[PDB]
Structure formats: structure tokens, C-alpha cells
Amino acid sequence: ADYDLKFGMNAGTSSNEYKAAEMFAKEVKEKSQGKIEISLYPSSQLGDDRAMLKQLKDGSLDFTFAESARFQLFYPEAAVFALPYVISNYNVAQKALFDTEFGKDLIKKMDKDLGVTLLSQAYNGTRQTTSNRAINSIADMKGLKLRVPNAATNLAYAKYVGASPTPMAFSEVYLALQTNAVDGQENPLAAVQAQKFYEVQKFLAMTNHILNDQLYLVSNETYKELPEDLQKVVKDAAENAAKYHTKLFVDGEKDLVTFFEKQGVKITHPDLVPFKESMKPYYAEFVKQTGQKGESALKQIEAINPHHH
Numbered sequence: 001a002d003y004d005l006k007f008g009m010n011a012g013t014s015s016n017e018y019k020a021a022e023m024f025a026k027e028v029k030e031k032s033q034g035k036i037e038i039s040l041y042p043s044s045q046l047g048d049d050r051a052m053l054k055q056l057k058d059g060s061l062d063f064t065f066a067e068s069a070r071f072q073l074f075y076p077e078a079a080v081f082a083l084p085y086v087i088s089n090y091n092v093a094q095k096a097l098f099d100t101e102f103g104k105d106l107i108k109k110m111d112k113d114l115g116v117t118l119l120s121q122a123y124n125g126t127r128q129t130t131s132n133r134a135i136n137s138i139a140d141m142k143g144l145k146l147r148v149p150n151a152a153t154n155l156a157y158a159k160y161v162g163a164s165p166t167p168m169a170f171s172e173v174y175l176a177l178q179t180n181a182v183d184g185q186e187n188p189l190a191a192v193q194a195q196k197f198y199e200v201q202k203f204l205a206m207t208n209h210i211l212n213d214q215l216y217l218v219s220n221e222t223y224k225e226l227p228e229d230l231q232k233v234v235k236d237a238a239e240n241a242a243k244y245h246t247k248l249f250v251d252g253e254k255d256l257v258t259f260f261e262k263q264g265v266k267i268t269h270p271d272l273v274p275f276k277e278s279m280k281p282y283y284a285e286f287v288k289q290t291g292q293k294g295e296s297a298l299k300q301i302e303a304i305n306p307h308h309h
């Protein structure tokens with residue numbers, strides 16, 4: 001309570017994100033000897049992630065989550081993190097952010113231009129596609145009214161596989177699916193579980209199309225005001241929570257398919273070759289729009305070996 005701080009997020013109280021944010025909050029309170037208390041504001045109470053990023057910049061929110069890909073809003077080449085099928089796995093996502101010149105520069109700009117400090121990175125699952133009718137092949141996407149978040153890379157995913165995208169906020173999705181205003185949505189399995197989308201979607205297709213990370217972000221206005229020993233408490237707690245965050249996602253990912261089958265969901269495994277083929281002209285458009293910066297980021301990312309060594 002010397003520092004009453006706030007951590008906003010789109011995820012809800014049943015989510016892995018929230019569980020790991022609770023761990024972070026508990027560690028910070030303990031190790032700051034009570035000087036800092038972090039309260040959680042889930043379910044987009046404060047707005048969406050675009051809004052919460054603005055609040056961190058302004059200093060009116062202290063902590064939030066965002067993907068590396070979400071920074072495409074300021075630096076177009078950062079969409080590389082969510083070009084479908086480009087990032088192979090989380091090992092690549094980690095090296096793309098921390099071990100490339102592109103990623104290192106992005107982190108610096110976040111701090112210097114956007115007033116946000118990157119404390120840690122976790123894995124947030126690989127997106128799959130749920131729907132009210134089977135997706136047995138890419139043909140089934142044609143005219144599927146597929147909800148997407150308000151993000152260019154997801155809108156593109158939907159466009160290029162032949163679906164009819166409808167952007168809407170995460171908070172509005174469950175109702176849209178339940179009323180069949182849309183036919184499907186796409187998110188990692190842990191979100192399908194957390195938001196109970198499986199109650200209102202009969203089918204799950206393993207499209208494996210976009211890999212999400214999650215960054216623990218702090219407003220510079222807040223971080224700069226903490227004495228350095230408290231900065232260290234926050235940084236160390238964010239790193240500890242991110243490892244736990246990743247583990248919740250990794251441990252659950254395979255098992256969740258069983259969980260959904262038991263809830264009555266039918267699982268399909270469409271041939272992904274035509275999905276990946278369909279993205280070829282999108283990668284071309286990305287390079288055309290983002291220029292040499294985008295080409296360079298793609299090359300640095302494609303150079304990363306996806307196997308742990």
C-alpha cells in the first residue's frame with residue numbers, strides 16, 4: 001500500500017494468465033515486505049489490450065499483458081510474430097524476441113518510444129479454430145463467419161484461408177458464438193477452456209495457425225518511481241511468474257484435447273498443407289507493405305532453428 005498498483009488483462013479469473021498474475025502479485029507483496037500490493041483487473045474491465053497499453057504509456061495502469069505481435073500497431077514489421085505459420089514454436093518466439101537484432105531493437109523502442117518496460121515473456125498457447133460445423137479441410141473455411149480479434153494478422157488469417165472475418169472484442173465472443181451470430185473463433189485451447197467456448201462450439205480443428213507469447217509489461221511511469229531494490233523484486237517476480245505461466249500452457253496443451261472430447265466436442269485434423277499454401281500471397285503482401293524492415297525481420301526469424309539445443 002505504499003504502492004497500490006494495478007495489473008489489467010483481457011483474460012478472466014479462470015485463465016492461466018490470471019493464475020500466473022496472481023503468483024506475480026503474491027511474490028511482489030511478500031518480497032517487498034508489503035510495500036507493494038498489486039490488484040488484478042481481469043476480463044477487460046479496463047478496456048481491451050490496445051486500451052491497456054495506452055494506459056501503461058500514460059501511467060494510469062501499472063502492469064498489463066500483451067503479445068509481441070501486438071506491437072505491430074506501432075511497428076508494422078512486428079506483425080512477423082503473428083504471420084500465420086511463420087513462427088514454428090515457442091523456442092523460436094523466444095529467440096525472435098531476445099536473440100535477434102530485430103527483437104532487441106523492438107524491446108528498446110518499447111521502453112524509449114512507448115514508455116513500457118518488458119519484464120518477462122511467457123508462452124500463451126497456439127491458436128486453433130472452433131466452429132459450429134466440422135472443419136475437415138480448408139474447403140470448410142469458405143464463408144465460415146469466423147470471429148477474430150481486432151488485429152490485422154488474425155483478420156488476414158481469416159481472409160486468406162477463405163473465411164468471412166468478423167472482428168470483435170474478446171469479451172463479446174461467447175455471446176456471438178452462443179447466438180450463432182458468428183460460426184467460429186480462433187484462440188489457444190486454454191482460452192477455449194477458460195472462456196468456456198466449448199459450451200457453445202461443437203467442433204475444434206487443429207489449425208495451429210498462430211503462436212502466442214505473452215509479455216509482462218510495466219509502465220515506465222511506475223517502474224521509474226520504484227527504488228531499485230523494489231524494481232528488482234518486480235523484475236525477479238515477473239521472470240518467476242513467466243516460467244510458471246509457460247508451464248501451465250505447456251502442461252495443458254495436449255491434455256486439453258481430451259478434456260474437450262469429454263465435453264462432447266468433435267476434434268478434427270485438417271491437412272495443413274493447403275492452409276500454409278494459402279498464406280503465401282499474404283507473406284508477399286507483408287513484404288510489400290513493410291518493405292526492407294519486414295523482409296529483414298522475416299529473414300532473421302526464418303534463420304532460427306526450432307529445435308532446442
Ligand SMILES: O=C(O)[C@]1(O)C[C@H](O)[C@@H](O)[C@H]([C@H](O)[C@H](O)CO)O1
Nearest residue numbers: 010011049067070149151169170187
Ligand atoms: O481476443 C482474443 O481472442 C485474444 O486471444 C484474447 C487475449 O487475451 C489477447 O491477448 C489476444 C490479442 O489481443 C490478439 O491475439 C491480438 O494480439 O486476443
